[PDB]
Amino acid sequence: METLVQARKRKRTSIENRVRWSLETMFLKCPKPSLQQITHIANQLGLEKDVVRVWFCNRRQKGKRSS
């Protein structure tokens, strides 16, 4: 109960499963998200730029170049 080292995916203190896919709808509006918009993305879900970059890495290669 009072432990913080056994999450399921990563964390839920400031990254609800809906917050991550909330980022998704914000990135599927334009294919040109500025790194400045990435700063507003962090303040948008209180996460670290490191988890927002790895999270957008998959959002970048979901199926644009399948071979």
Swiss-Prot record:
Q: Which residues carry this modification: Phosphoserine?
A: S14, S67
Which sequence positions carry the modification called Phosphothreonine? T13
Outcome of K29R?
Answer: No change in sumoylation. No change in sumoylation. Loss of sumoylation. No change in nuclear localization
Location in the cell: Cytoplasm; Nucleus
Q: Which domain of life is it from?
A: Eukaryota
Q: How is it modified after translation?
A: Sumoylation enhances the protein stability, DNA binding and transactivation activity. Sumoylation is required for enhanced YES1 expression. Ubiquitinated; undergoes 'Lys-63'-linked polyubiquitination by WWP2 leading to proteasomal degradation.
Q: Which organs or tissues contain this protein?
A: Expressed the totipotent and pluripotent stem cells of the pregastrulation embryo. Also expressed in primordial germ cells and in the female germ line. Absent from adult tissues.
Biotech use: POU5F1/OCT4, SOX2, MYC/c-Myc and KLF4 are the four Yamanaka factors. When combined, these factors are sufficient to reprogram differentiated cells to an embryonic-like state designated iPS (induced pluripotent stem) cells. iPS cells exhibit the morphology and growth properties of ES cells and express ES cell marker genes.
Query: What is expression of this protein induced or repressed by?
Result: Repressed by retinoic acid (RA). Expression is activated by NR5A2 epiblast stage of development. Upon cell differentiation, expression is repressed by NR6A1.
Name the DNA-binding stretches.
Answer: 8-67
Give the record's family classification: Belongs to the POU transcription factor family. Class-5 subfamily.
The function of this protein is: Transcription factor that binds to the octamer motif (5'-ATTTGCAT-3'). Forms a trimeric complex with SOX2 or SOX15 on DNA and controls the expression of a number of genes involved in embryonic development such as YES1, FGF4, UTF1 and ZFP206. Critical for early embryogenesis and for embryonic stem cell pluripotency.
What is said about its interaction partners and assembly? Interacts with PKM. Interacts with WWP2. Interacts with UBE2I and ZSCAN10. Interacts with PCGF1. Interacts with ESRRB; recruits ESRRB near the POU5F1-SOX2 element in the NANOG proximal promoter; the interaction is DNA independent. Interacts with ZNF322. Interacts with FBXW4. Interacts with SOX2 and SOX15; binds synergistically with either SOX2 or SOX15 to DNA. Interacts with DDX56.
Tell me the domain comment.
The POU-specific domain mediates interaction with PKM. The 9aaTAD motif is a transactivation domain present in a large number of yeast and animal transcription factors.
Q: What is the designated name of this protein?
A: POU domain, class 5, transcription factor 1
Ranked from the top, the taxonomy reads: Eukaryota, Metazoa, Chordata, Craniata, Vertebrata
Report the portion of the entire protein shown.
Answer: 217 to 282 of 352
